[PDB]
Amino acid sequence: KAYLVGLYTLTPTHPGQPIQRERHTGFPVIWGQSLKGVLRSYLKLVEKVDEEKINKIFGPPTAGLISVGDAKILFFPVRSLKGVYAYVTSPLVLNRFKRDLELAGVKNFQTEIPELTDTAIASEEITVDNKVILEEFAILIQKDDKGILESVVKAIEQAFGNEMAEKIKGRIAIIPDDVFRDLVELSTEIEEYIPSDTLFYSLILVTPRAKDNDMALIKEVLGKINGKYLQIGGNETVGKGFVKVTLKEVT
Domain ranges of the chain: 1-251
**9 contacts 196 by C-beta, under 8 angstroms:** yes
49 contacts: CB under 8 Å, gap ≥ 6? 43, 221, 224
119, 124, 129, 134: CA torsion to nearest 10: -60
Assign residue 209 a region: left if phi > 0, alpha if psi is -120 to 50, beta otherwise?
Answer: alpha
Rounded Cα–Cα distance for residues 159 and 161 (Å): 6
Angstrom distance (rounded) from CA 168 to CA 11? 17
Other C-beta atoms lying within 10 Å of the C-beta of residue 32: 16
Q: Report the first-to-last Cα separation within the chain, whole angstroms.
A: 8
What totals of helices (H) and strands (E) does the chain contain, helices first?
A: 7, 12
Please choose, from the candidates 200, 168, 84, 64, the residue with its C-alpha nearest in 3D space to the C-alpha of residue 134: 84
Distance separating alpha carbons of residues 118 and 139, to the nearest angstrom: 7
Find out whether 142 and 121 touch, Cβ atoms under 8 Å: yes
Distance of CA 26 to the CA centre of its chain: 16
79 φ, ψ to 5°? -60, 125
- Inter-axis angle of helices 177-186 and 91-104, to 10 degrees? 90
- With beta carbons less than 8 A apart as the criterion, state whether 9 and 233 touch: no
CA 149 – CA 147 distance, rounded (Å): 6
Question: What are the distances in angstroms from CA 167 to CA 18, 51, 86, 232?
Answer: 28, 36, 11, 21
Q: Which residue in 248, 235, 251 sits closest to 11, CA to CA?
A: 235
Give 115-119's long-range contacts (Cβ < 8 A, gap of 24+).
115/91, 116/90, 116/91, 116/142, 116/174, 116/175, 116/176, 116/177, 117/176, 118/176, 119/176
Query: Residues for the chain: how many in total?
Result: 251
Full DSSP string of 148-187: HHHHHHHHHHHHH-HHHHHHHTT-EEE--HHHHHHHHHHS
Rounded (10°) angle between helices 91-104 and 148-160: 40
Q: What angle do CA 148, 152, 157 make, to 5 degrees?
A: 150
3-state SS assignment for residue 58: coil
Closest CA to 197 of 57, 52, 78: 78
Decide: 88 and 173 in contact? Cβ < 8 Å. Answer: yes
Burial (CB count within 10 angstroms: exposed 0-12, middle 13-18, buried 19+), residue 110: exposed
> What is the stated resolution of the deposited model, in angstroms?
2.8
Tell me the C-alpha distance between 141 and 129, whole Å.
9
Distances (CA, A) of 116 to 53, 123, 140, 187: 47, 16, 11, 20
Closest of 23, 6, 144 to residue 75, by C-alpha: 6
- Contact between 164 and 199 under an 8 Å Cβ cutoff? The reply is yes
With H, G, I as helix, E, B as strand and everything else as coil, classify residue 139.
Answer: strand
CA distances from 121 to 35, 83, 99, 177, 220 (A): 32, 15, 21, 13, 40
Spatial CB neighbours of 191, under 8 Å, sequence gap ≥ 6: 14, 17, 235
